[PDB]
Amino acid sequence: MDKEAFLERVREGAELIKMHIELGHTIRLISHRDADGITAGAILAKAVAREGGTFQLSIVKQVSEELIDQLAREKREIYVFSDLGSGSIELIEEKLNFATVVVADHHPPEKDSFSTDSHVLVNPVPFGANSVRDLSGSGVAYFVAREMNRKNRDMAYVAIVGAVGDMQEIDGTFHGLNLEIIEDGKELGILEVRKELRLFGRESRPLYQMLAYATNPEIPEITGDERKAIEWLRAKGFDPEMKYWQLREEEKRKLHEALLVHMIKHGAPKEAIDRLIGDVVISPLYPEGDVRHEAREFATLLNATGRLNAGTLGVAICLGDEEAYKVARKMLDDYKKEQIEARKFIIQNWNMVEEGEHAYVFYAGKNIRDTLVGIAANMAINAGLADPEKPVVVLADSDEDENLVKGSARTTEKALEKGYHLGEALKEVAEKLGGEGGGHAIAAGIRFPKNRIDEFIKLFNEALGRQ
Protein backbone atom coordinates (compact mmCIF):
# COMPACT_ATOMS: atom_id res chain seq x y z
CA MET A 1 0.00 0.00 0.00
CA ASP A 2 3.11 2.20 0.28
CA LYS A 3 2.18 3.78 3.60
CA GLU A 4 5.31 5.96 3.76
CA ALA A 5 4.48 7.97 0.64
CA PHE A 6 1.00 8.56 2.01
CA LEU A 7 2.33 9.54 5.44
CA GLU A 8 4.57 12.05 3.66
CA ARG A 9 1.52 13.86 2.28
CA VAL A 10 -0.07 13.65 5.73
CA ARG A 11 2.90 15.44 7.28
CA GLU A 12 2.87 17.92 4.41
CA GLY A 13 -0.72 18.85 5.23
CA ALA A 14 -0.27 18.74 9.00
CA GLU A 15 2.71 21.08 9.16
CA LEU A 16 1.10 23.38 6.59
CA ILE A 17 -1.97 23.83 8.81
CA LYS A 18 0.14 24.39 11.94
CA MET A 19 2.19 26.96 10.04
CA HIS A 20 -0.89 29.10 9.43
CA ILE A 21 -2.06 28.54 13.01
CA GLU A 22 1.25 29.93 14.26
CA LEU A 23 0.86 32.80 11.80
CA GLY A 24 -2.47 33.65 13.44
CA HIS A 25 -4.48 32.84 10.31
CA THR A 26 -8.03 31.52 10.66
CA ILE A 27 -8.27 27.97 9.34
CA ARG A 28 -11.19 27.83 6.90
CA LEU A 29 -12.79 24.38 7.16
CA ILE A 30 -15.10 22.80 4.57
CA SER A 31 -16.58 19.32 5.07
CA HIS A 32 -19.22 16.97 3.64
CA ARG A 33 -22.78 16.64 4.97
CA ASP A 34 -22.94 12.94 5.93
CA ALA A 35 -21.52 11.25 9.05
CA ASP A 36 -18.15 10.67 7.39
CA GLY A 37 -17.87 14.42 6.81
CA ILE A 38 -19.20 15.76 10.10
CA THR A 39 -16.79 13.53 12.04
CA ALA A 40 -13.91 14.48 9.73
CA GLY A 41 -14.68 18.17 10.14
CA ALA A 42 -14.72 17.82 13.92
CA ILE A 43 -11.37 16.01 14.00
CA LEU A 44 -9.72 18.87 12.11
CA ALA A 45 -11.56 21.50 14.18
CA LYS A 46 -10.34 19.76 17.32
CA ALA A 47 -6.78 19.81 15.99
CA VAL A 48 -6.92 23.54 15.18
CA ALA A 49 -8.38 24.43 18.58
CA ARG A 50 -5.92 22.22 20.48
CA GLU A 51 -3.09 24.28 18.98
CA GLY A 52 -4.66 27.53 20.16
CA GLY A 53 -5.77 28.21 16.60
CA THR A 54 -9.02 29.55 15.19
CA PHE A 55 -11.42 28.17 12.56
CA GLN A 56 -14.60 28.83 10.57
CA LEU A 57 -16.52 25.71 9.60
CA SER A 58 -18.85 24.91 6.69
CA ILE A 59 -20.88 21.73 6.14
CA VAL A 60 -21.82 21.42 2.48
CA LYS A 61 -23.57 18.89 0.24
CA GLN A 62 -20.85 18.69 -2.39
CA VAL A 63 -17.99 20.61 -3.94
CA SER A 64 -19.20 22.70 -6.87
CA GLU A 65 -17.78 25.55 -8.96
CA GLU A 66 -20.19 28.03 -7.36
CA LEU A 67 -18.91 26.95 -3.96
CA ILE A 68 -15.24 27.27 -4.89
CA ASP A 69 -15.83 30.74 -6.30
CA GLN A 70 -17.68 31.75 -3.10
CA LEU A 71 -14.69 30.57 -1.10
CA ALA A 72 -12.19 32.35 -3.34
CA ARG A 73 -14.08 35.60 -2.73
CA GLU A 74 -13.48 35.15 1.01
CA LYS A 75 -9.75 35.53 0.30
CA ARG A 76 -8.63 33.25 3.12
CA GLU A 77 -5.02 32.37 3.83
CA ILE A 78 -5.76 28.65 4.04
CA TYR A 79 -8.65 26.40 2.94
CA VAL A 80 -9.02 22.90 4.38
CA PHE A 81 -11.39 20.58 2.50
CA SER A 82 -12.50 17.50 4.42
CA ASP A 83 -14.11 14.39 2.84
CA LEU A 84 -14.36 16.45 -0.37
CA GLY A 85 -12.49 17.92 -3.30
CA SER A 86 -10.78 14.87 -4.79
CA GLY A 87 -12.81 15.15 -7.99
CA SER A 88 -12.30 18.91 -8.11
CA ILE A 89 -8.51 19.20 -8.15
CA GLU A 90 -7.92 21.32 -11.26
CA LEU A 91 -10.94 23.38 -10.23
CA ILE A 92 -9.55 24.04 -6.74
CA GLU A 93 -6.06 24.58 -8.15
CA GLU A 94 -7.03 27.31 -10.61
CA LYS A 95 -9.40 29.37 -8.48
CA LEU A 96 -7.49 29.03 -5.20
CA ASN A 97 -3.84 29.31 -6.30
CA PHE A 98 -3.42 32.44 -4.17
CA ALA A 99 -3.95 30.52 -0.94
CA THR A 100 -2.89 27.35 0.83
CA VAL A 101 -5.29 24.44 0.43
CA VAL A 102 -5.25 21.02 2.08
CA VAL A 103 -7.54 18.27 0.82
CA ALA A 104 -8.12 15.43 3.29
CA ASP A 105 -10.31 12.93 1.45
CA HIS A 106 -10.49 9.27 0.35
CA HIS A 107 -12.62 9.46 -2.80
CA PRO A 108 -11.03 8.53 -6.17
CA PRO A 109 -9.06 11.65 -7.16
CA GLU A 110 -9.11 13.53 -10.46
CA LYS A 111 -5.30 13.74 -10.46
CA ASP A 112 -2.73 12.12 -8.17
CA SER A 113 -1.35 15.47 -7.03
CA PHE A 114 -1.57 19.26 -7.19
CA SER A 115 0.88 20.95 -9.57
CA THR A 116 1.88 23.62 -7.04
CA ASP A 117 3.41 23.26 -3.58
CA SER A 118 0.92 25.15 -1.42
CA HIS A 119 -1.72 22.67 -2.55
CA VAL A 120 -1.46 19.16 -1.08
CA LEU A 121 -3.72 16.19 -1.79
CA VAL A 122 -3.92 14.02 1.32
CA ASN A 123 -5.45 10.82 -0.04
CA PRO A 124 -4.53 7.15 0.38
CA VAL A 125 -6.00 6.01 -2.94
CA PRO A 126 -3.17 7.23 -5.25
CA PHE A 127 -0.79 5.07 -3.19
CA GLY A 128 -2.81 1.87 -3.47
CA ALA A 129 -5.52 1.97 -0.82
CA ASN A 130 -9.08 0.85 -1.48
CA SER A 131 -11.33 3.92 -1.30
CA VAL A 132 -14.21 2.00 0.30
CA ARG A 133 -12.55 -0.29 2.86
CA ASP A 134 -8.99 0.89 3.68
CA LEU A 135 -9.78 4.35 5.11
CA SER A 136 -12.61 6.89 5.13
CA GLY A 137 -12.79 10.68 5.12
CA SER A 138 -12.75 10.84 8.91
CA GLY A 139 -9.81 8.45 8.75
CA VAL A 140 -7.55 10.64 6.62
CA ALA A 141 -8.56 13.63 8.75
CA TYR A 142 -7.51 11.57 11.77
CA PHE A 143 -4.06 10.88 10.30
CA VAL A 144 -3.58 14.60 9.67
CA ALA A 145 -4.67 15.53 13.20
CA ARG A 146 -2.44 12.86 14.74
CA GLU A 147 0.60 14.21 12.89
CA MET A 148 -0.18 17.71 14.14
CA ASN A 149 -0.30 16.45 17.70
CA ARG A 150 -0.55 12.89 19.04
CA LYS A 151 -3.12 13.98 21.63
CA ASN A 152 -5.67 14.00 18.81
CA ARG A 153 -5.63 10.22 19.13
CA ASP A 154 -8.49 10.81 21.59
CA MET A 155 -10.63 11.42 18.49
CA ALA A 156 -10.10 7.78 17.45
CA TYR A 157 -13.70 6.79 18.19
CA VAL A 158 -15.07 9.84 16.36
CA ALA A 159 -12.92 8.76 13.43
CA ILE A 160 -14.40 5.26 13.52
CA VAL A 161 -17.94 6.66 13.70
CA GLY A 162 -17.22 8.13 10.28
CA ALA A 163 -15.81 4.85 8.98
CA VAL A 164 -19.00 3.03 10.01
CA GLY A 165 -21.19 5.76 8.54
CA ASP A 166 -19.17 5.38 5.35
CA MET A 167 -19.66 1.60 5.66
CA GLN A 168 -15.93 0.81 5.65
CA GLU A 169 -16.82 -2.38 7.53
CA ILE A 170 -19.52 -3.40 5.06
CA ASP A 171 -18.28 -7.00 5.12
CA GLY A 172 -18.51 -7.33 8.89
CA THR A 173 -15.01 -6.24 9.91
CA PHE A 174 -12.43 -3.45 9.48
CA HIS A 175 -9.50 -3.35 7.05
CA GLY A 176 -6.55 -1.23 5.96
CA LEU A 177 -5.54 1.86 7.92
CA ASN A 178 -8.81 1.72 9.88
CA LEU A 179 -7.27 -1.07 11.98
CA GLU A 180 -4.53 1.32 13.07
CA ILE A 181 -7.04 3.91 14.27
CA ILE A 182 -8.93 1.26 16.21
CA GLU A 183 -5.74 0.22 17.99
CA ASP A 184 -5.14 3.87 18.94
CA GLY A 185 -8.67 3.85 20.34
CA LYS A 186 -8.01 0.61 22.20
CA GLU A 187 -4.79 1.98 23.74
CA LEU A 188 -6.65 5.04 25.04
CA GLY A 189 -9.61 2.88 26.07
CA ILE A 190 -12.16 5.09 24.32
CA LEU A 191 -13.48 2.38 22.00
CA GLU A 192 -14.07 -1.37 22.16
CA VAL A 193 -14.69 -3.77 19.29
CA ARG A 194 -17.43 -6.27 20.12
CA LYS A 195 -18.79 -9.25 18.22
CA GLU A 196 -22.49 -8.41 18.17
CA LEU A 197 -25.51 -7.81 15.95
CA ARG A 198 -24.35 -5.45 13.20
CA LEU A 199 -27.81 -3.95 12.74
CA PHE A 200 -28.93 -0.42 13.46
CA GLY A 201 -30.79 0.38 16.65
CA ARG A 202 -29.02 -1.34 19.52
CA GLU A 203 -29.28 1.80 21.63
CA SER A 204 -32.56 3.44 20.67
CA ARG A 205 -34.78 0.94 18.84
CA PRO A 206 -37.04 -1.95 19.86
CA LEU A 207 -35.69 -5.40 18.97
CA TYR A 208 -38.42 -5.99 16.38
CA GLN A 209 -37.50 -2.83 14.45
CA MET A 210 -33.81 -3.70 14.74
CA LEU A 211 -34.62 -6.90 12.83
CA ALA A 212 -37.28 -5.66 10.39
CA TYR A 213 -35.08 -2.85 9.05
CA ALA A 214 -32.16 -5.20 8.39
CA THR A 215 -30.84 -4.90 4.83
CA ASN A 216 -27.16 -5.85 4.99
CA PRO A 217 -27.83 -8.61 4.84
CA GLU A 218 -31.60 -9.03 4.86
CA ILE A 219 -33.20 -11.50 7.27
CA PRO A 220 -35.44 -13.90 5.30
CA GLU A 221 -39.17 -13.80 6.15
CA ILE A 222 -38.41 -11.07 8.72
CA THR A 223 -36.95 -8.01 6.99
CA GLY A 224 -39.82 -5.71 6.06
CA ASP A 225 -42.52 -7.27 8.23
CA GLU A 226 -42.51 -5.85 11.77
CA ARG A 227 -45.41 -8.13 12.73
CA LYS A 228 -43.55 -11.23 11.53
CA ALA A 229 -40.52 -9.99 13.48
CA ILE A 230 -42.58 -9.47 16.65
CA GLU A 231 -43.98 -12.98 16.33
CA TRP A 232 -40.43 -14.31 15.88
CA LEU A 233 -38.91 -12.74 18.99
CA ARG A 234 -41.83 -13.83 21.18
CA ALA A 235 -41.51 -17.41 19.91
CA LYS A 236 -37.82 -17.45 20.83
CA GLY A 237 -38.72 -16.05 24.24
CA PHE A 238 -37.60 -12.47 23.72
CA ASP A 239 -39.14 -9.13 24.67
CA PRO A 240 -39.84 -7.63 21.22
CA GLU A 241 -40.12 -4.14 22.75
CA MET A 242 -36.83 -4.36 24.65
CA LYS A 243 -33.71 -2.69 23.28
CA TYR A 244 -30.58 -4.67 22.39
CA TRP A 245 -28.45 -2.91 25.02
CA GLN A 246 -30.94 -3.95 27.71
CA LEU A 247 -30.15 -7.61 27.07
CA ARG A 248 -27.59 -9.50 29.13
CA GLU A 249 -24.50 -10.98 27.50
CA GLU A 250 -26.17 -14.35 28.04
CA GLU A 251 -29.35 -13.25 26.25
CA LYS A 252 -27.36 -11.64 23.43
CA ARG A 253 -25.59 -14.91 22.67
CA LYS A 254 -28.89 -16.78 22.40
CA LEU A 255 -30.22 -14.06 20.12
CA HIS A 256 -27.15 -14.63 17.95
CA GLU A 257 -27.79 -18.38 18.04
CA ALA A 258 -31.40 -18.09 16.87
CA LEU A 259 -30.27 -15.79 14.05
CA LEU A 260 -27.40 -18.10 13.12
CA VAL A 261 -29.81 -21.04 12.93
CA HIS A 262 -32.32 -18.86 11.08
CA MET A 263 -29.80 -17.95 8.38
CA ILE A 264 -28.53 -21.52 8.06
CA LYS A 265 -32.11 -22.77 7.71
CA HIS A 266 -32.47 -20.40 4.75
CA GLY A 267 -29.09 -21.36 3.30
CA ALA A 268 -27.29 -18.05 3.79
CA PRO A 269 -23.61 -17.93 2.74
CA LYS A 270 -20.93 -17.57 5.42
CA GLU A 271 -20.25 -14.05 4.12
CA ALA A 272 -23.87 -13.04 4.76
CA ILE A 273 -23.71 -14.42 8.30
CA ASP A 274 -20.38 -12.67 8.95
CA ARG A 275 -22.03 -9.39 7.88
CA LEU A 276 -24.99 -9.93 10.20
CA ILE A 277 -22.86 -10.81 13.23
CA GLY A 278 -19.44 -9.20 13.50
CA ASP A 279 -17.55 -6.06 14.47
CA VAL A 280 -19.55 -3.47 16.41
CA VAL A 281 -17.72 -0.46 17.83
CA ILE A 282 -18.64 0.72 21.32
CA SER A 283 -17.35 3.64 23.40
CA PRO A 284 -17.02 3.66 27.23
CA LEU A 285 -16.97 7.47 26.98
CA TYR A 286 -20.77 7.39 26.71
CA PRO A 287 -23.44 5.64 28.83
CA GLU A 288 -25.03 2.49 27.40
CA GLY A 289 -28.46 3.34 26.00
CA ASP A 290 -27.24 6.63 24.55
CA VAL A 291 -26.99 6.84 20.74
CA ARG A 292 -23.36 7.93 21.14
CA HIS A 293 -22.43 4.62 22.79
CA GLU A 294 -22.29 2.74 19.48
CA ALA A 295 -20.81 3.94 16.17
CA ARG A 296 -23.64 3.16 13.74
CA GLU A 297 -26.23 4.82 15.97
CA PHE A 298 -23.91 7.81 16.45
CA ALA A 299 -23.40 8.17 12.68
CA THR A 300 -27.16 7.99 12.24
CA LEU A 301 -27.54 10.86 14.68
CA LEU A 302 -24.98 12.92 12.75
CA ASN A 303 -26.53 12.13 9.37
CA ALA A 304 -29.74 13.44 10.88
CA THR A 305 -28.14 16.75 11.94
CA GLY A 306 -26.75 17.01 8.42
CA ARG A 307 -30.17 16.67 6.80
CA LEU A 308 -31.75 19.10 9.27
CA ASN A 309 -29.52 22.05 8.28
CA ALA A 310 -27.53 21.60 11.50
CA GLY A 311 -24.31 19.85 10.47
CA THR A 312 -22.22 22.26 12.53
CA LEU A 313 -24.25 21.14 15.54
CA GLY A 314 -23.30 17.53 14.82
CA VAL A 315 -19.67 18.65 14.76
CA ALA A 316 -20.06 20.31 18.15
CA ILE A 317 -21.31 16.99 19.54
CA CYS A 318 -18.20 15.13 18.40
CA LEU A 319 -16.09 17.85 20.01
CA GLY A 320 -17.74 17.04 23.35
CA ASP A 321 -20.41 19.75 23.64
CA GLU A 322 -23.09 18.06 25.77
CA GLU A 323 -25.37 21.07 25.29
CA ALA A 324 -25.23 20.55 21.53
CA TYR A 325 -26.37 16.97 22.06
CA LYS A 326 -29.30 18.33 24.06
CA VAL A 327 -30.16 20.59 21.15
CA ALA A 328 -30.00 17.59 18.83
CA ARG A 329 -32.11 15.45 21.18
CA LYS A 330 -34.92 17.98 21.61
CA MET A 331 -34.75 18.59 17.86
CA LEU A 332 -35.40 14.92 17.10
CA ASP A 333 -37.82 14.30 19.97
CA ASP A 334 -39.91 17.37 19.13
CA TYR A 335 -40.63 15.80 15.75
CA LYS A 336 -41.52 12.45 17.29
CA LYS A 337 -43.69 14.53 19.62
CA GLU A 338 -45.53 16.06 16.65
CA GLN A 339 -46.15 12.66 15.06
CA ILE A 340 -47.73 11.56 18.32
CA GLU A 341 -49.71 14.80 18.55
CA ALA A 342 -50.93 14.34 14.97
CA ARG A 343 -52.42 10.92 15.73
CA LYS A 344 -53.94 12.18 18.99
CA PHE A 345 -55.73 15.07 17.32
CA ILE A 346 -57.26 13.14 14.43
CA ILE A 347 -58.62 10.36 16.64
CA GLN A 348 -60.09 12.61 19.34
CA ASN A 349 -61.72 14.97 16.84
CA TRP A 350 -62.82 12.26 14.40
CA ASN A 351 -66.46 13.07 15.19
CA MET A 352 -65.94 16.07 12.87
CA VAL A 353 -65.10 14.47 9.53
CA GLU A 354 -66.81 15.43 6.29
CA GLU A 355 -67.78 11.89 5.32
CA GLY A 356 -68.96 11.79 1.73
CA GLU A 357 -70.32 9.00 -0.44
CA HIS A 358 -66.81 7.81 -1.32
CA ALA A 359 -64.30 9.48 1.00
CA TYR A 360 -63.51 10.96 4.41
CA VAL A 361 -62.18 14.52 4.43
CA PHE A 362 -60.57 15.93 7.58
CA TYR A 363 -59.28 19.50 7.68
CA ALA A 364 -56.91 20.07 10.61
CA GLY A 365 -55.83 23.63 9.81
CA LYS A 366 -52.73 24.60 11.80
CA ASN A 367 -53.13 21.71 14.26
CA ILE A 368 -51.08 19.28 12.18
CA ARG A 369 -47.88 20.07 10.31
CA ASP A 370 -47.75 19.72 6.49
CA THR A 371 -45.63 16.63 6.65
CA LEU A 372 -47.52 14.66 9.29
CA VAL A 373 -50.75 14.78 7.26
CA GLY A 374 -50.15 11.34 5.75
CA ILE A 375 -49.47 9.42 8.96
CA ALA A 376 -52.53 11.08 10.48
CA ALA A 377 -54.63 9.64 7.66
CA ASN A 378 -53.15 6.18 8.25
CA MET A 379 -54.01 6.48 11.94
CA ALA A 380 -57.73 6.92 11.28
CA ILE A 381 -57.57 3.84 9.06
CA ASN A 382 -55.47 1.64 11.35
CA ALA A 383 -57.65 2.44 14.36
CA GLY A 384 -60.42 0.67 12.44
CA LEU A 385 -62.28 3.94 12.91
CA ALA A 386 -62.76 4.71 9.21
CA ASP A 387 -64.60 2.35 6.87
CA PRO A 388 -61.67 0.34 5.40
CA GLU A 389 -63.33 0.46 1.95
CA LYS A 390 -63.53 4.26 2.13
CA PRO A 391 -60.41 6.43 1.45
CA VAL A 392 -59.32 9.06 3.99
CA VAL A 393 -57.97 12.55 3.28
CA VAL A 394 -56.32 14.80 5.86
CA LEU A 395 -55.74 18.48 5.13
CA ALA A 396 -53.54 21.02 6.89
CA ASP A 397 -52.40 24.58 6.31
CA SER A 398 -49.03 24.72 4.57
CA ASP A 399 -45.96 26.04 6.38
CA GLU A 400 -44.29 27.48 3.27
CA ASP A 401 -47.29 29.41 1.91
CA GLU A 402 -50.40 30.74 3.68
CA ASN A 403 -53.28 30.68 1.19
CA LEU A 404 -52.37 27.08 0.44
CA VAL A 405 -53.43 23.70 1.87
CA LYS A 406 -51.42 20.48 1.68
CA GLY A 407 -53.31 17.20 1.77
CA SER A 408 -52.62 13.48 1.65
CA ALA A 409 -54.93 10.56 0.93
CA ARG A 410 -54.48 6.98 2.11
CA THR A 411 -56.64 3.87 1.82
CA THR A 412 -56.53 0.06 1.85
CA GLU A 413 -56.28 -3.05 -0.33
CA LYS A 414 -60.00 -3.67 0.19
CA ALA A 415 -60.82 -0.20 -1.12
CA LEU A 416 -58.55 -0.60 -4.14
CA GLU A 417 -60.66 -3.61 -5.19
CA LYS A 418 -63.47 -1.15 -5.92
CA GLY A 419 -61.20 0.26 -8.63
CA TYR A 420 -60.13 3.29 -6.58
CA HIS A 421 -56.96 5.19 -7.51
CA LEU A 422 -56.12 8.10 -5.21
CA GLY A 423 -53.30 9.34 -7.45
CA GLU A 424 -55.43 9.68 -10.57
CA ALA A 425 -58.28 11.22 -8.57
CA LEU A 426 -56.07 13.76 -6.81
CA LYS A 427 -54.54 14.57 -10.21
CA GLU A 428 -57.93 15.49 -11.67
CA VAL A 429 -59.07 17.60 -8.70
CA ALA A 430 -55.73 19.42 -8.51
CA GLU A 431 -55.93 20.42 -12.18
CA LYS A 432 -59.48 21.72 -11.70
CA LEU A 433 -58.58 23.73 -8.59
CA GLY A 434 -55.33 24.92 -10.12
CA GLY A 435 -52.93 23.03 -7.89
CA GLU A 436 -50.68 19.98 -7.93
CA GLY A 437 -51.61 16.40 -7.14
CA GLY A 438 -50.80 12.80 -7.95
CA GLY A 439 -49.29 9.60 -6.59
CA HIS A 440 -49.92 5.87 -6.36
CA ALA A 441 -53.33 4.19 -6.24
CA ILE A 442 -53.17 3.55 -2.49
CA ALA A 443 -51.42 6.78 -1.47
CA ALA A 444 -51.25 10.28 -2.96
CA GLY A 445 -50.92 13.96 -2.12
CA ILE A 446 -52.15 17.38 -3.20
CA ARG A 447 -51.67 21.12 -2.71
CA PHE A 448 -54.36 23.71 -3.56
CA PRO A 449 -55.86 27.10 -2.44
CA LYS A 450 -57.25 27.17 1.11
CA ASN A 451 -60.35 29.05 -0.06
CA ARG A 452 -61.59 26.10 -2.15
CA ILE A 453 -61.77 23.34 0.48
CA ASP A 454 -65.54 22.90 0.06
CA GLU A 455 -64.98 22.61 -3.67
CA PHE A 456 -62.27 20.00 -3.05
CA ILE A 457 -64.61 17.81 -0.99
CA LYS A 458 -67.15 17.85 -3.82
CA LEU A 459 -64.64 17.28 -6.61
CA PHE A 460 -62.80 14.50 -4.78
CA ASN A 461 -65.96 12.54 -4.06
CA GLU A 462 -67.00 13.00 -7.69
CA ALA A 463 -63.57 11.94 -8.97
CA LEU A 464 -63.82 8.68 -7.02
CA GLY A 465 -67.40 8.17 -8.19
CA ARG A 466 -66.19 7.78 -11.77
CA GLN A 467 -64.03 4.82 -10.70
Side-chain angles (χ1 to χ4, degrees), residues 1-226 229-249 251-368 370-399 401 403-405 407-467:
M1 184 261 167
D2 188 10
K3 192 179 178 189
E4 286 288 351
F6 170 61
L7 286 173
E8 187 278 327
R9 296 266 252 264
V10 174
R11 193 189 172 194
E12 200 160 309
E15 300 303 319
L16 228 41
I17 289 167
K18 295 178 66 181
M19 199 202 64
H20 286 271
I21 293 185
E22 291 168 7
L23 268 35
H25 299 150
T26 293
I27 313 297
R28 188 70 169 94
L29 299 179
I30 305 94
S31 213
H32 190 245
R33 190 194 295 195
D34 58 17
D36 193 25
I38 294 185
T39 55
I43 291 172
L44 294 172
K46 185 77 176 192
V48 179
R50 198 187 295 269
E51 305 295 322
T54 257
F55 66 90
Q56 177 189 336
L57 178 62
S58 287
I59 300 298
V60 302
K61 177 55 191 173
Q62 62 180 15
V63 41
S64 62
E65 184 180 1
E66 321 167 18
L67 182 58
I68 302 295
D69 285 297
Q70 266 195 36
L71 293 173
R73 291 190 291 263
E74 299 188 358
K75 296 173 68 176
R76 303 292 182 156
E77 227 82 15
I78 176 171
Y79 303 91
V80 182
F81 299 99
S82 196
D83 194 30
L84 286 165
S86 297
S88 323
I89 290 187
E90 290 195 0
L91 216 187
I92 290 175
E93 190 160 42
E94 192 209 18
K95 295 181 168 291
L96 296 182
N97 46 15
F98 62 89
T100 307
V101 7
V102 169
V103 169
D105 187 31
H106 74 112
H107 295 83
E110 185 185 13
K111 293 158 60 190
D112 274 355
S113 188
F114 288 92
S115 65
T116 58
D117 282 341
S118 288
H119 297 21
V120 49
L121 175 72
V122 194
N123 194 313
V125 171
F127 304 105
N130 195 322
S131 166
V132 304
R133 73 201 299 267
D134 286 343
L135 199 60
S136 78
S138 43
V140 36
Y142 177 80
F143 271 76
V144 170
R146 190 179 58 174
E147 244 316 287
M148 292 173 60
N149 193 329
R150 284 197 64 198
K151 288 173 184 181
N152 289 322
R153 272 157 69 242
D154 57 19
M155 296 297 289
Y157 176 57
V158 174
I160 294 311
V161 172
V164 179
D166 189 47
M167 301 185 184
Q168 296 279 328
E169 32 62 273
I170 193 67
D171 74 328
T173 181
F174 290 91
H175 306 271
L177 300 179
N178 290 303
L179 293 172
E180 172 170 352
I181 302 184
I182 283 181
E183 283 310 311
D184 281 347
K186 283 179 179 174
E187 295 170 19
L188 292 192
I190 70 185
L191 66 84
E192 304 174 3
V193 179
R194 296 272 195 270
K195 263 61 170 56
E196 296 182 359
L197 242 185
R198 285 179 29 85
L199 300 180
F200 167 79
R202 76 151 262 175
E203 304 284 355
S204 77
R205 285 304 208 273
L207 259 359
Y208 75 95
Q209 278 181 350
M210 190 172 180
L211 303 191
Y213 292 96
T215 66
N216 187 81
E218 302 204 349
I219 305 178
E221 276 222 88
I222 289 178
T223 287
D225 194 9
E226 299 175 352
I230 288 181
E231 181 189 40
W232 191 92
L233 292 168
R234 295 233 183 90
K236 313 302 171 179
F238 288 109
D239 190 347
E241 216 69 35
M242 189 168 294
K243 301 173 186 172
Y244 187 93
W245 71 271
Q246 292 180 305
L247 298 171
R248 277 156 294 175
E249 297 311 304
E251 296 180 304
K252 284 178 190 167
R253 297 191 204 96
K254 285 190 179 57
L255 216 197
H256 302 165
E257 289 185 358
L259 288 169
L260 216 214
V261 171
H262 188 84
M263 298 296 280
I264 294 180
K265 275 169 177 167
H266 283 83
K270 183 174 174 177
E271 57 89 4
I273 303 189
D274 283 326
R275 270 152 49 207
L276 184 67
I277 301 170
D279 281 9
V280 173
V281 181
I282 256 64
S283 177
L285 288 181
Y286 298 93
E288 191 144 7
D290 186 306
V291 293
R292 288 171 293 178
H293 179 255
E294 188 271 321
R296 190 176 313 282
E297 200 115 30
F298 201 160
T300 303
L301 173 68
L302 302 177
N303 280 324
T305 57
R307 299 190 325 268
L308 289 179
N309 258 85
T312 188
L313 182 85
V315 162
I317 304 179
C318 295
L319 295 176
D321 189 318
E322 180 71 23
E323 201 82 356
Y325 174 76
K326 290 175 186 168
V327 173
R329 279 260 53 94
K330 184 172 180 296
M331 187 186 299
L332 291 179
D333 298 337
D334 279 350
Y335 193 55
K336 174 66 171 184
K337 204 182 313 305
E338 283 186 341
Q339 300 179 12
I340 295 172
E341 184 56 44
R343 310 194 194 196
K344 190 236 289 185
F345 190 88
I346 188 176
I347 285 188
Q348 272 179 345
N349 303 292
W350 183 254
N351 39 267
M352 298 292 296
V353 270
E354 263 273 331
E355 183 174 0
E357 189 183 348
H358 297 273
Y360 297 98
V361 177
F362 184 94
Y363 173 65
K366 301 284 181 182
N367 290 304
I368 312 179
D370 302 22
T371 61
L372 286 343
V373 159
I375 70 187
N378 286 125
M379 187 48 150
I381 294 176
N382 291 322
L385 204 50
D387 178 14
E389 256 179 349
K390 186 172 297 190
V392 169
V393 176
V394 178
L395 307 167
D397 295 344
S398 67
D399 277 21
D401 210 277
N403 307 333
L404 198 68
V405 161
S408 270
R410 316 285 155 170
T411 191
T412 72
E413 256 69 31
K414 234 261 192 173
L416 255 39
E417 291 176 356
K418 305 172 98 297
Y420 283 146
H421 191 304
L422 302 178
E424 290 183 356
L426 248 20
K427 243 291 181 301
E428 291 181 350
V429 176
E431 179 170 354
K432 292 180 172 301
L433 292 175
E436 304 175 6
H440 295 19
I442 210 172
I446 188 178
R447 48 166 295 271
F448 65 92
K450 179 161 64 182
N451 48 36
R452 305 179 76 172
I453 288 185
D454 272 18
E455 197 180 345
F456 170 85
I457 297 186
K458 188 173 69 66
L459 289 174
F460 184 62
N461 279 300
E462 283 175 354
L464 297 178
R466 309 183 198 110
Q467 52 187 251

